């Protein structure tokens, strides 16, 4: 690998501790590094470091080489994972990243839902909620002018930070689009089949309106709590409902304004979807009247 000065970090700054997971073509583990800013080159601060697995072959590594470079193009922005920095000289590859400090946005509304003075007012109130979906949509607009398409988009793919700034992660992954087994369940139990847009599901088709069916899910997910869509809907069913143009009912304690925008993203055709910058717009709008 070259160096590239511009984002070379000596790992020997780099203090590796707990794992966070895997499924990524190589493992993330937590870590301390110093200096990261050079400024101040014995402060101490948590970063990601991305690494391949210790059996892994050369279809792995050039993988992570790709998520790298992808990541060093699509350049900083406050609503997605930043790149930090690399480790590619005089030892294994490491892929430096941000590290949130509250998990991914699923989990952190799940263990936030409201009991079923302050006796029933619940740690989510409605304006942070809308918050959330607005920052998601900001960073998938920086996505989109640095021509990504992310193919994935869920709440579990988005980090959370102590300041709770929504932060897109895993947007610069081979997500392996002509081989995709429908039924498996991920790591989480999860199916991704179900955040598929129609033409991605059935054309093989990926666009940045595919993402926009993908954050209507998303929107689904924020206003459930970090419910899981298509409710006790086998994927068997979920292709023939979709081959009849069904949708997702409205949620309990959801306002109509937000529901409309759902189902907008849900659009059969991706030419009348929202685009990011309307989506942006139109929560910015919602944010300014609550
Ligand atoms: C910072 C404090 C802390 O420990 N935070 C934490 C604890 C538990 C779970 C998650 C976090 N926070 C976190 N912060 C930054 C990054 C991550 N997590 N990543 C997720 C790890 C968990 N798990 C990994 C395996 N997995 C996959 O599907 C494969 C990725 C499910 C999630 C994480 O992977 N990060 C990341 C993001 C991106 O986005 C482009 C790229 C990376 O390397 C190139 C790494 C950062």
Redesign the pocket.
């Known amino acids: 690998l070259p160096l590239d000065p511009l984002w070379e970090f000596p790992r020997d700054r780099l203090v590796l501790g ?1 794992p ?5 073509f190589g ?2 583990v ?1 870590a301390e590094a110093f200096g990261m800013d050079p400024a101040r080159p014995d402060q101490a601060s ?3 470091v ?1 690494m391949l697995k210790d059996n892994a072959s050369d279809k792995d590594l050039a993988d ?1 080489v790709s ?2 470079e992808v ?1 060093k193009l699509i350049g900083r922005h406050k609503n ?2 930043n ?1 930090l920095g690399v480790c590619t000289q005089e030892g294994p590859l490491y ?1 430096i ?8 946005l699923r989990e952190f509304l799940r263990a936030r839902r409201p009991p079923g003075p302050r006796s029933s007012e619940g740690p989510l109130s409605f304006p942070v909620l809308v918050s959330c979906a607005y920052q998601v949509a900001r960073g998938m607009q920086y996505l989109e002018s640095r021509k990504c398409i992310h193919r994935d988009l869920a709440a ?2 988005v ?1 959370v930070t102590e300041d709770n700034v929504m ?7 081979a997500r392996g689009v002509h081989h995709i087994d429908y039924y498996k369940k ?2 989480n139990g999860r199916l991704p089949v179900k955040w598929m847009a129609p033409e991605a599901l059935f054309d093989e088709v990926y666009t940045h309106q595919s993402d926009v069916w993908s954050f209507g899910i998303l929107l689904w997910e924020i206003f459930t709590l970090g419910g899981s869509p298509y409710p006790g809907i086998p994927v068997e069913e979920l292709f023939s409902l979709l081959r009849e143009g069904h949708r997702m009912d409205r949620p309990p304690h959801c306002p109509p304004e937000l529901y409309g925008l759902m189902r907008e993203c849900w659009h059969a055709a991706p030419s009348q979807r929202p685009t990011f910058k309307q989506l942006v717009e139109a929560l910015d709008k919602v944010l300014l009247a609550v």
Not at 97 to 104: P, Q
Not at 167 to 173: E, M, S, V, Y
């Open positions: 707990k966070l997971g895997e499924g990524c493992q993330v937590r948590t970063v990601a991305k992570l998520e790298m990541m997605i994972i790149l892929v990243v941000e590290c949130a400090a509250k998990g991914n579990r793919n980090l932060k897109i992660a895993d947007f610069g992954l991920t790591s």
